[model samples]
Target: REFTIDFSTQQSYVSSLNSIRTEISTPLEHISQGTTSVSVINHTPPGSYFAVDIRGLDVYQARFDHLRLIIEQNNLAVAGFVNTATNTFYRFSDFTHISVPGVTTVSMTTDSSYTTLQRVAALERSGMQISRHSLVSSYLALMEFSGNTMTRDASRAVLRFVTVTAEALRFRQIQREFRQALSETAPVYTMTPGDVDLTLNWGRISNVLPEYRGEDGVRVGRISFNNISAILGTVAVILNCH
Candidate 1:
């Protein structure tokens, strides 16, 4: 039987711009086995076989072209690239139809909305919910069941490490800002707008309060206190050295 796996970065760390990019790529790489035959139900002809259905975000709307370039480099058998945020969709083959250079977008429909991919991550079966996860947990499950020589637990371990890499990048950003603020009195680390935005986003990636003082603190990627709302709005709030 042909199988399908649906992955959407609707409500977890995976939805964040920086994180989502890496998150989806993992599954994409795995799905490329056979170039991956056991799982893909929507296979296309040779020379073009992988497919991707991407939902868009307003924050990233202007950068869809960049996204297309990135996805294109993967050379998957993609039927199309759909961005709900831009209300646009495009087929890999159809892109050649655009006579205009630097232009490669096609129109999409409202009914194509990926409600579950966004609101929840689960099977296509109606009301057949498995877990409440909207991020890593769900992603691994799809990789395993979408077809496998793959094991779910192993996917879990690998993904957990993804956060380690994510946090390391964030910690470096914070460290840099902290040094910049050390010239003054009380260790007041400053974040100038989106300087600290490690893609945790505004959906609440932290259980650790915006204030600092803990060991295993779940950082909010920190926040912003500067008036550079002209730069980072979600930041207007960060620091242990505050």
Candidate 2:
């Protein structure tokens, strides 16, 4: 595979091309484009770090971790932004086979039914699901106050939070009812590249769209799965697969 670089006309053409590393890697080949040009590169070694932009996972994790506190804090909306993120992850991973970077796949095969059930238990071990639902239940209880239909924003928020993870984490939760479930499904995510910290900066992403708060009207501020999916897939292609 080859990696290409494109330079803008505003950039000093020579400096832009000259800046590319060419020491021990591989030679860069120039491709065409009027004033701005491109190159096809081979032998590009893996870089020092990698990053994943998690739009709302942190918010979701926060709400799930502190249901009572978050629900009590925002009387109108317990945790919309956070739910958006956790659902986005479920949406993103469910459609495709998830591969953990910087980890070997030698033991990643599925065998008996018992083992498959064990693998998914990884999610339940975290115990975040319990809190997420509890938070939602408290939000739903608000509807009882005046027989008000849940706001559209709240509707979609509930849908995304429930749909995917509901199915994925179901069995994991089921076995736990009978006994302790210790499957390590969540660890696959821990295998992310060493350079990636895997922590969410909640302040930056949470409460990003305050307008979507109220009890009615469209939740335009809420992000859709398609938008999140596009951004994530594009990031992977542009960065990791470039």
Candidate 3:
């Protein structure tokens, strides 16, 4: 299942104020004074993912920060934050999230019925070898070894591989499709206006593989053509994404 979380903020502004006093009424009979106030209400949606609301302070300003999303081992992490004010995406290694009063932050995850870990376990149980390399490489190796065998275990291996591969492609597709939406709606800097000194950990998708590899992990064997061709066909069915 895929989901989207929205974060937004609003502000109130005072436009005018009036005060009056009558000297004659004060001196002759009774003093009378009155005041009038007018306020304008405005709601500012998240300007590219960061909402900064400063209550009781007149330091409110518009924000327009940018973030480039990168996938790391089934987790979505930040590559860099493009500070529109500075016109640069600063690179950082640590993953951080800021929680403050009057600020809103959002994160999301997508998944399938079976997680990557679960699939890996299933593959191992079905007599497929697990390598220190990525899950994709391991699956590709299994598919190559099992080539056209059609045995029960081989069939199970193929099924799990297809499921994992499909989910991986779907996850990548969602990230690519929602990149702009997440950038424009999610909050990157929530402390000060135009401040890009914050980070939000995007967590991970347990249902998908950690990496996508088509050639590097592939195996060339006696049945290389058949295995590679079959893998390519499976990828096409899953609509492989870069």
What is the per-residue lDDT of model 1 for residues 50-138, given as tens digits with 9 covering 90 to 100? 22332221222232211221122122212333333333333333333322223345432211122312233232222222221322343
Q: Give the alpha-carbon lDDT of every model.
A: 0.27, 0.22, 0.22
Candidate with maximal lDDT: 1
Give every collision pair in model 1.
32-35, 32-36, 33-36, 49-77, 50-76, 50-77, 50-78, 224-237
lDDT (tens digit, per residue) of candidate 2 on 103-205: 3222212221212322433332232332223334534432221212233333333432332122111111221221111122221111112101111111221
For model 2, state the Cα shift of residue 1 in Å: 52
- lDDT string for model 3 (5-114, tens) is 11122111111000000100011111111221111111222211222111211112322122112212112222222222333322222322322223222221212122
Query: Backbone collision count in every prediction?
Result: 8, 3, 4
Alpha-carbon deviation at 48 in model 3, angstroms: 20
Lowest-lDDT window of 10 residues in candidate 2? 67-76
Q: Which of 2 and 3 is ahead in TM-score?
A: 3
How many clashes in candidate 1?
8
Which candidate's TM-score is highest?
Answer: 1
Of candidates 2 and 1, the better by TM-score: 1
